[PDB]
Amino acid sequence: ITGRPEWIWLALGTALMGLGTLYFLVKGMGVSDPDAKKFYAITTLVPAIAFTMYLSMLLGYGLTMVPFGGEQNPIYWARYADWLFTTPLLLLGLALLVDADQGTILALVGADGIMIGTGLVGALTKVYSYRFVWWAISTAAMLYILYVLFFGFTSKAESMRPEVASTCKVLRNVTVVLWSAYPVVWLIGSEGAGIVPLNIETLLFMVLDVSAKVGLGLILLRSRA
Amino acid sequence: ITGRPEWIWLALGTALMGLGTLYFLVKGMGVSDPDAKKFYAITTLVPAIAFTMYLSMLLGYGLTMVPFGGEQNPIYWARYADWLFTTPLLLLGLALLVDADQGTILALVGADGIMIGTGLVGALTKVYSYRFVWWAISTAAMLYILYVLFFGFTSKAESMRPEVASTCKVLRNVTVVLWSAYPVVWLIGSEGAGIVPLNIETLLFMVLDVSAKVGLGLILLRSRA
Amino acid sequence: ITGRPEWIWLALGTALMGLGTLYFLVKGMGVSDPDAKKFYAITTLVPAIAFTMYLSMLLGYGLTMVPFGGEQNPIYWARYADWLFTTPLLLLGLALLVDADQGTILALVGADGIMIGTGLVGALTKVYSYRFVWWAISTAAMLYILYVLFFGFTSKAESMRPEVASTCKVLRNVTVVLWSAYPVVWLIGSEGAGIVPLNIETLLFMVLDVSAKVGLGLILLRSRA
Numbered sequence: 001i002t003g004r005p006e007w008i009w010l011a012l013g014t015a016l017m018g019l020g021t022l023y024f025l026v027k028g029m030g031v032s033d034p035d036a037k038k039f040y041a042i043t044t045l046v047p048a049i050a051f052t053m054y055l056s057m058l059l060g061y062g063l064t065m066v067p068f069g070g071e072q073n074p075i076y077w078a079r080y081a082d083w084l085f086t087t088p089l090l091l092l093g094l095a096l097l098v099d100a101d102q103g104t105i106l107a108l109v110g111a112d113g114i115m116i117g118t119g120l121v122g123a124l125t126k127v128y129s130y131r132f133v134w135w136a137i138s139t140a141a142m143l144y145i146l147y148v149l150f151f152g153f154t155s156k157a158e159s160m161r162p163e164v165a166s167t168c169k170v171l172r173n174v175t176v177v178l179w180s181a182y183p184v185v186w187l188i189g190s191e192g193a194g195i196v197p198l199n200i201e202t203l204l205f206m207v208l209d210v211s212a213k214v215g216l217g218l219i220l221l222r223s224r225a
Numbered sequence: 226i227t228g229r230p231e232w233i234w235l236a237l238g239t240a241l242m243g244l245g246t247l248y249f250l251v252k253g254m255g256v257s258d259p260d261a262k263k264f265y266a267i268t269t270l271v272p273a274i275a276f277t278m279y280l281s282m283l284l285g286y287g288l289t290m291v292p293f294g295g296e297q298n299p300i301y302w303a304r305y306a307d308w309l310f311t312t313p314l315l316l317l318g319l320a321l322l323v324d325a326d327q328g329t330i331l332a333l334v335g336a337d338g339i340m341i342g343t344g345l346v347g348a349l350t351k352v353y354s355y356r357f358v359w360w361a362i363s364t365a366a367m368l369y370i371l372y373v374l375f376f377g378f379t380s381k382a383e384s385m386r387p388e389v390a391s392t393c394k395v396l397r398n399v400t401v402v403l404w405s406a407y408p409v410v411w412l413i414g415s416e417g418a419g420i421v422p423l424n425i426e427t428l429l430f431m432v433l434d435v436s437a438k439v440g441l442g443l444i445l446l447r448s449r450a
Numbered sequence: 451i452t453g454r455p456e457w458i459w460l461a462l463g464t465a466l467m468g469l470g471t472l473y474f475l476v477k478g479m480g481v482s483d484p485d486a487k488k489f490y491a492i493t494t495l496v497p498a499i500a501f502t503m504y505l506s507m508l509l510g511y512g513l514t515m516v517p518f519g520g521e522q523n524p525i526y527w528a529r530y531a532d533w534l535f536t537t538p539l540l541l542l543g544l545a546l547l548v549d550a551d552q553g554t555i556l557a558l559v560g561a562d563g564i565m566i567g568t569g570l571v572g573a574l575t576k577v578y579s580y581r582f583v584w585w586a587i588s589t590a591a592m593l594y595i596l597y598v599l600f601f602g603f604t605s606k607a608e609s610m611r612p613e614v615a616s617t618c619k620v621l622r623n624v625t626v627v628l629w630s631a632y633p634v635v636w637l638i639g640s641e642g643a644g645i646v647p648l649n650i651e652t653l654l655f656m657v658l659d660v661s662a663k664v665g666l667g668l669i670l671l672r673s674r675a
């Protein structure tokens with residue numbers, strides 16, 4: 001039921017992240033414009049990082065227990081480490097894409113940081129009632145992140161090239177929905193409520209990752225710079 | 226006596242940090258000069274960060290036990306996390322204020338890092354005698370920080386505008402004293418000696434925070450840039 | 451046998467790092483060119499950081515136990531913290547030396563990060579078989595680091611000054627060998643296999659550190675900039 005029934009979704013997850021990394025490694029070896037290089041650096045780190053964090057969830061070093069609700073619950077603090085580094089790089093990705101000010105960057109990054117850090121604390125709190133208090137705060141940092149993301153990576157992501165507002169209206173819809181999913185998924189699943197089995201939650205989070213991870217990598221890279 | 230008698234000073238602390246954040250959020254929404262924006266980004270992160278870290282001290286996730294001296298002691302490792310991120314942002318604040326070299330910045334930041342990191346280790350060591358060895362080292366990193374702060378955020382904080390040396394002679398006296406307080410307070414209180422009840426120590430650290438946090442935020446922001 | 455027979459190599463290690471820091475502190479106090487300052491900032495942080503991490507290994511706060519193989523093993527997670535910060539600064543050192551692109555930097559840094567972070571996880575895994583899986587991955591991140599280091603801090607470290615390719619052909623051979631040693635040493639010693647006593651491993655790692663730490667500091671600094 002825990003650290004058992006889902007290794008399949010976790011094993012498949014490692015496979016995907018890793019071939020995903022292998023892919024970006026043997027498809028970025030060239031690169032000319034220092035700029036483009038930066039974008040490739042980023043798109044590789046994410047998969048590689050998310051790669052190892054998923055291998056620790058598979059092997060079991062990144063799965064702990066947490067007393068809450070009345071019994072012992074499985075919490076993959078390994079996930080939290082994953083996003084704890086991916087989300088900011090990825091965020092730096094989008095930012096540098098529509099070239100933003102170091103002010104909205106430091107804002108965003110650190111903001112994202114209160115989001116994930118706070119979320120992690122939530123995920124480890126032992127008294128039920130509280131888990132959701134943190135769920136709420138982390139959310140707020142994410143609704144703020146996303147806010148800047150939307151109203152911004154639209155406007156400040158328009159006054160430029162021809163396709164700018166186009167490709168951009170894509171990336172947004174996709175990042176916005178994609179992201180707001182983690183908040184929900186978390187909530188309904190094991191690490192929060194108990195409306196979704198850990199068995200399903202993982203599969204959900206995995207589709208969730210692989211997409212955000214590579215998916216967003218590709219789409220992102222495809223947006224020239 | 227522990228994680229009990231002081232919730233009042235901790236509850237009041239959360240209130241203050243948070244309304245403090247709410248304040249900077251709904252008073253920075255405008256901003257023009259990318260520069261000014263950076264300063265607002267910073268002044269908000271601090272309260273927000275210090276906000277959540279104080280809510281974890283309130284709720285109890287950020288309060289642990291440490292065997293030293295002969296009995297079990299309460300240590301809010303949550304404080305250490307707080308300053309572990311605030312102090313460097315805040316430091317980046319002052320630095321960018323009198324526009325310094327990336328050399329004195331990386332120096333300062335990392336220096337501050339040996340200060341807090343080392344301090345944290347101190348706060349968690351179990352053998353009495355040692356606690357103070359770390360107290361000493363962390364201090365040294367802080368006397369070095371402050372050193373650059375004083376002899377610098379005076380000189381290198383003078384050859385510019387008219388009020389420069391003025392406002393600046395303010396900020397200094399205030400940061401210097403304010404800071405050197407944490408070293409002392411720590412020392413006389415529970416997490417170190419036993420000359421001050423945890424009951425009082427908290428109130429002291431709280432006045433201490435709220436001031437450093439917002440106080441320094443305002444004063445800081447008020448210094449144009 | 452553990453946290454006992456080697457304090458000598460650890461005590462000598464603290465001495466060396468610290469006088470090493472004292473040295474860079476009272477030999478960098480001047481400095482003119484903001485640039486040179488940055489290089490001095492870096493060379494000091496390393497010793498100072500590595501200083502405190504070695505004092506925690508000496509005093510015993512940075513030495514833990516890990517069930518693997520069949521019995522309890524001593525693991526100085528304190529080492530891992532050490533390199534966890536040194537290696538990236540040091541890396542930033544070499545990078546800025548042959549002035550590289552922010553792309554190869556972010557790449558390198560983060561890469562180094564998967565190396566050390568991953569290594570650390572290895573060092574703490576309880577099931578024998580696995581330890582070496584992580585040993586393998588961390589290695590891969592290091593063979594990639596070093597790769598860029600060699601084929602790069604040669605070419606991209608040539609088309610410049612007269613001595614460039616010279617001094618540079620030095621620094622390389624020295625960093626390359628020096629580094630690849632930590633991977634091997636780790637492997638044959640206590641924290642991995644059992645072909646080397648913890649008694650010897652420490653002495654090895656210490657010579658290893660002091661050299662990388664100061665040695666590389668000097669050599670590095672001596673390369674003007």
Ligand SMILES: *C/C=C(C)/C=C/C=C(C)/C=C/C1=C(C)CCCC1(C)C
Pocket residue numbers: 083086087090115116119120122135138139142179180182183186209212213
């Ligand atoms: C590669 C991973 C990505 C892009 C992850 C994004 C994750 C989030 C936006 C997570 C958000 C969460 C909350 C808003 C509430 C608490 C639970 C979290 C951490 C899943």
Ligand SMILES: *C/C=C(C)/C=C/C=C(C)/C=C/C1=C(C)CCCC1(C)C
Pocket residue numbers: 308311312315340341344345347360363364367404405407408411434437438
């Ligand atoms: C918002 C928080 C701020 C500005 C905190 C500043 C804190 C310090 C300068 C703390 C210094 C300490 C020492 C010098 C010795 C060990 C105890 C500490 C960590 C309280």
Ligand SMILES: *C/C=C(C)/C=C/C=C(C)/C=C/C1=C(C)CCCC1(C)C
Pocket residue numbers: 533536537540565566569570572585588589592629630632633636659662663
């Ligand atoms: C001052 C310390 C320095 C320059 C340390 C460098 C360390 C490494 C390159 C360590 C590498 C390791 C592996 C490749 C495999 C796992 C064991 C490690 C962490 C020792």
